[PDB]
Symmetry: D2
Subunit: 441 residues, 4 copies
């Protein structure tokens, strides 16, 4: 169909999409013909660009502008044609199996999942999240709890990396499996250690999950350790499924996305209906992360109240203790699901409120109608804080309207201007570690 | 009195909104079916080989879909006590039960009533086949990369002592060569193979036997599955049952099943003698003990006179040579593997096989419909055999079923019209089958 | 598609062999041991025998001969005129392939080596520590003892020929036993040694147990005549009946004795003489005797004989169930966790009962010389352990001659009431069809 | 300060009379070997690379053999605390420890003919069989990876790069259990196995009682074998490998490449397939240059049918290695040889025998081109094992002052190449001790 020089390879499916119905295959193909192709292409490039020697992002992706991918139809199932893929993703002309699987992964979540809902109620949003993970063969039936979600920051310095490896090698010396946001630095070090420790302790089925969104994976290649890759429709459905599959959470330094994620966490942990649930939240870093955490906690205790630190707990420069506590909490998390009658792998009990599930358009009017009142209940005040925060993080990676920072005025944030005064040094502090301007009186 | 069972195999990871949907559907009129089938599942291997008498004893039995946050459970109010060893359900029985929950409630209920999958008109043949595939994929029944070894084994409900022995032997041979059996879940001809194949898999240290039994809600409800069946599948109607028999077999051995097997072959030949399927490899062997000779042959004549010597290519008869039937099968696998390899086709499912729409949809033997059934030699062989199958479906047991009798006492017998010699051959077959104990209800 | 010279590769036993050991196989194969290795190998290949014959079945293949090949990697086996039923489409049946290399394992590699070749010193073969440590290295080299194995092994004894009831019933015991995820070990033979495994199969099937272990133990003279039954997964051949019985005891976590005619009497008296010994008052080895309806009286006379000879203290080590298939499994399954605990507290292994003190008396083999028979001390002043040990050697010889015609009938210098119960049991067994041979 | 350990993998099912053998062997003079090797195994993974001083901290340590009816247990008096997690011994550390109980207490003590070349080879096999390292029915993927104890960072990176490429092709690594070049190949291999989903890595590390006494096994070694001497350690290196890859190990690579070319160039081994790739970074081009020159002159250019030199192409190093594997299988197939043990390879009994560098013997060593190539290299290795060892050991400093320097007989041109290679080896910083 094309006479040019176009290095091709035909890949068979590995670990997803393997048993496909015919009428599903058609659907896969008709979707790869829609406008969705760009995402499907750009994600598939980042998937084959994993663990690239050159530690770049935009420039790495621009080199392969000759790249393309096609969905090939066969009576049995389906195959992926790879025109001009990066050479590093192949050994002796065979695709590396990790990558293969993570490729067919992107077929699954971007063209099979993301297609059927986006190219076509908080109960629907959860059962749908469950369904995605079930289809991802990620909820293992009869699995004792060992999953420790690790949130963290895109860029991090050398000490912070070192310490997050140590937490990992510990987590792993205790036979605990890790999830992250499939990205780099903080989302990577914990697995990198947990492997070594998984090794030493002869653990034989290391789960290193990695949850992400269309807009993140299109630019950010999954770090190489990720052995299971899940892509969810939006951040909103990403954070929800983070929480539901976790048996522990360990926030790291990181800066902006972390802070935003913490508020998401807390406003589900402080809701009444969830005073019985057991999800250990240990924040941690290295010695030089002392002041950073400090001001974080100061911010929460001001906004949400001191009663908010019911739910968290800060260990500093004790890699071993963080893994020890996470290991001890695992029985309790089982039991706490035992007597609810709740799946060990999916926390159906945790009540996440529709405000936490509803997506925040980065529209200017959205922040201009935002509310920050101490009279608002702790839950509502925290959800609005998180939605403003996930909008700022989207203002550099989604680029849906980058010039709307001050297009007809600054984001009218009506309410206690002292909440913003606390974020003054907080936001500049993230800029300090390289992680009324935007608000309004 | 009341035991609560956990899932085993089927229904292990359920979404809440789904568990839920079971309990509603469990309350619908469908309930009696769900109960009947679950009582049958628990009465497998019953020391009493009684059909209706065995189930009528357990009238106090009843079953309840219980909801928990994790998943779903089953409440067993007065279960037959045999099915419990030291208080625990027999793991086999457990998994068969949760199979009835899968195909009876999550599968039958859902596609017939709630339009959750919209795009399913269930007349379009593409939709019927793809569905037959979704049913099977969900029963974890199709395996990816499973090199071909499934010998589907059609037979007869009641069979004499010799036929059993002979069919057990074929199974032993089949399983001495590491071939897995699939039957129609029942007793006799559908039990005897798996029963021997078991000793075969054993001697040959074959591990992970697959003894599939495929069935339909009316069959299972009256007839418990035989105790050997390892994977239970319940297809909505015979039509979907046969159609799935085809697609998942890599070989087919038709044992002697009385006048029933006659429409069986015809159905098989219908798809086989089709020009788009002149390339598909599907070993069709018939076989039987010494005495089954006469019975296979009188069949043979009829087929060749109605369809031709060309029909004799697709099948093969063998008699009292058990082993050779295992031998030809084990041989034909690699060719069947290949036949799929070049057509770019799944090993476990035969997508390419064109089963014809008139064979997918059901046929009702209305006295008007019967006589309009075109049966003459000009009409191509495909249509000839398929109408011959529908014509045999109605006239066979046209006197056993009291529906046929009452209707052939009102509107008269089946005055079918087509070609004189054909109704001669269609007769012959029945006069011989009657000679072998295997106005009339029919007319020219 | 097969010939009459076929070359079989190893399966499951003798897989990794050093060249110097490979040589040892061939030199022992050319020595006088050959007939044994020949007869046994024919036997193994004649399992699943469609024809229900014994000696007539094996005498038909006089052309069969087997030879030890040599390659650099290991050993292979040369089958010259094997029987055809043990091959399918020119492949050897994988069952028979193991059991063949099994016989190669124990008859030539073991029995050859330990008897004479001083390649292994420190083999007094009289010291009872040596016999026991030897029985271990056998079941070890036979990959028979599994590390970290929760106890599920139930040894079954019984009669090689049994009516159709005794078989049907022993089948049900198996079915139930199996349904509880228990593994059976018998003496490899027919009838009472087949039915437990035969049923045990179906229920292992119903309960999705995925590693049946139908062990069968035997000794060279028996297997030469009796082909193992088709169910046997592990074949193990022990040098003599004595070392076979010791290893029975060591591997069992339960012993059921079925209706084995007068053939079980020495069997029970063998168990008792280790169970009633002192240092074994803490050990946990359930001993049920069972049978179907008609076996009732057959145990009856039996139990009487033991009570009166050894005492009612022998009823401590056994129990008796009749026609309750289901129960004999239920109790057996129940006893497993206790058997784990008793080996646990004692610091002992689960697969091998080191701590049972088996009498050196019972380990050594018995000569029923008329002098030795008379000198056999059969008095109740002697302790119950030695009383049962001497009562067994008495029954093994008197029941199972040319010498009672040369010298005389077996005038045992025993206590008369012991001799009185002895003859009364023999007469009661004659009522059940199960000057005399004694005096 | 005491813990008790159960057996993991090694020594798990033992007969009672064997157990007794373990105890009395432990109480003898072999105790010190056991203890210092046991100590080193518990010291794997330590951040401190002061191999010796590390052991000097834990001089309180001691180790007792515990009897039980079931088997054996290991009492640990004052064990290093880092080798535990929440009181649980690290499983890796558990296993290698019992492997020292295996090869040092059980094996070494008991075996101490050993004079007949066939007896030595069958024993090396019985040692590898008891170590459960020979897998029956195993496609050949073992690449033995020789190298040097301390290498700079560019050889460490390069050796790692090799491994990753080896791994990425589903190939297992065998090394000398140490660090430096014996670690980076496995360390790489690790990352790669993962990427390709290779789920059964076999990072065999073989060694001798003297080596492991002071040196903790590097943390990647899955399976630890300890052979009695070096002579048997090498012979074993040879029979289990399917290829060999020689990293830049300084002058320590000289006798090695000779020993190997000895068995390769002997006649009866003209049909065996054992690839030999020598690789390294760019800094190693001169270093391999003089090595290859010295050989082409002494043994002939026929010797370069047996060794190939690749420099700075890690991919190809593996690519060829991975291509060789099917050929090494077939080569064992048609000979009727094991795929796990190269029984057919003829090792000459002199290469199996230890060489004592007595002034008399090294002078008696025949070193002239008149003798044949197989013998020449053998004597050349026995030459270098004393010559270069001269400038380091006292037998080549102290003995050459007492009875005079080493006046070797043979041919002058050979001795010229020898000295010329050495002068090379001094120039890359890797009458003297030799005349
Ligand atoms: N609550 C809960 N139960 C689960 C889960 N996964 C598996 N199970 C098992 O379901 C089985 C049914 O026992 P129930 O007592 O009725 O469970 P329930 O809490 O919902 O009532 C339990 O097995 P069991 O008989 O109790 O054995 P075991 O759990 O003690 O080992 C339990 O282990 C889960 O994610 N949540
Ligand atoms: N058509 C088809 N291919 C399948 C099936 N299952 C697995 N395969 C794999 O697909 C490979 C065929 O590659 P292609 O030759 O391109 O098939 P294609 O023309 O239809 O695209 C098979 O090669 P292979 O030679 O069969 O490898 P192997 O399975 O013997 O290892 C096998 O690895 C199936 O059910 N149908
Ligand atoms: N007696 C015996 N023990 C064995 C055997 N195999 C493994 N073990 C284990 O030994 C462990 C007990 O620790 P030890 O320190 O050795 O006991 P000991 O004092 O009697 O020597 C148990 O693990 P655990 O987890 O502590 O006990 P459990 O819960 O598994 O039963 C037990 O399972 C065996 O063949 N026999
Ligand atoms: N040389 C050698 N042979 C081994 C090894 N391991 C297993 N075998 C097998 O021994 C079996 C006997 O076949 P032969 O044809 O006699 O082998 P040979 O030439 O090497 O002597 C072969 O099985 P097969 O059924 O005949 O063929 P295959 O498909 O299993 O490979 C072969 O694979 C080994 O480490 N080395
Ligand atoms: N045993 C084992 N098992 C796995 O699954 C692994 N995945 C990645 C590694 C490597 O990660 C570390 C990288 O840290 P680095 O040395 O580059 O600074 C290496 O020390 C390696 O052990 C690894 N090791
Ligand atoms: N799961 C399992 N595993 C083995 O290893 C087996 N070996 C033999 C059998 C058979 O036992 C019965 C034979 O008795 P039959 O009724 O045929 O006379 C068959 O119905 C089979 O189940 C078997 N089953």
């Amino acid at each position: 169909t094309d006479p040019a020089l176009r290095a091709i390879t035909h890949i068979s499916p590995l670990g997803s999409m393997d048993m496909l119905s015919q009428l599903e295959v058609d659907m896969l193909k008709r979707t790869a013909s829609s406008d969705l192709y760009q995402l499907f292409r750009n994600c598939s490039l980042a998937v084959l660009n994993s663990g690239s020697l050159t530690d770049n992002s935009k420039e790495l992706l621009s080199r392969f502008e000759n790249f393309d991918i096609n969905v090939l139809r066969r009576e049995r199932g389906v195959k992926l044609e790879l025109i001009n893929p990066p050479e590093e993703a192949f050994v002796d002309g065979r695709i590396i199996r990790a990558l293969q699987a993570n490729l067919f992964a992107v077929l699954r979540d971007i063209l099979f999942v993301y297609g059927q809902i986006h190219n076509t109620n908080s109960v629907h949003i959860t059962n749908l999240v469950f369904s995605i993970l079930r289809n991802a063969r990620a909820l293992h039936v009869g699995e004792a709890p060992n999953m420790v979600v690790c949130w963290g920051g895109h860029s991090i310095n050398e000490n912070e990396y070192l310490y997050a490896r140590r937490v990992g090698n510990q987590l792993g010396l205790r036979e605990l499996n890790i999830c992250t946001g499939c990205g780099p630095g903080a989302m990577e070090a914990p697995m990198k250690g947990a492997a070594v420790g998984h090794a030493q302790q002869r653990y034989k089925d290391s789960r290193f999950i990695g949850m992400t969104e269309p807009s993140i994976i299109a630019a950010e290649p999954p770090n190489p350790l990720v052995n299971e890759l899940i892509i969810m429709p939006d951040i909103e459905k990403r954070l929800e499924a983070f929480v539901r599959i976790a048996h522990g959470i360990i926030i790291f330094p990181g800066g902006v996305g972390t802070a935003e994620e913490l508020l998401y966490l807390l406003g589900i942990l402080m809701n009444p209906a969830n005073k019985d649930q057991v999800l250990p939240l240990i924040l941690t870093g290295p010695k030089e992360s002392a002041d950073y955490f400090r001001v974080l906690d100061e911010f929460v205790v001001h906004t949400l109240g001191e009663n908010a630190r019911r739910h968290y707990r800060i260990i500093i420069d004790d890699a071993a203790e963080v893994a020890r506590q996470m290991k001890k909490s695992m029985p309790l998390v089982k039991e706490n699901r035992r007597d609810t009658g709740d799946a060990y792998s999916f926390n159906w009990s945790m009540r996440i409120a529709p405000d936490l599930q509803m997506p925040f358009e980065p529209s200017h009017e959205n922040m201009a109608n935002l509310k920050l009142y101490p009279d608002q209940p702790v839950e509502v005040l925290a959800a609005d804080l998180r939605r403003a925060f996930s909008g700022i993080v989207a203002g550099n990676v989604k680029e849906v309207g980058i010039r709307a920072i001050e297009e007809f005025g600054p984001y009218k944030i009506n309410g206690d201007k002292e909440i913003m005064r606390r974020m003054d040094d907080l936001l500049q502090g993230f800029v300090a570690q390289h992680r009324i301007p935007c608000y309004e009186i």
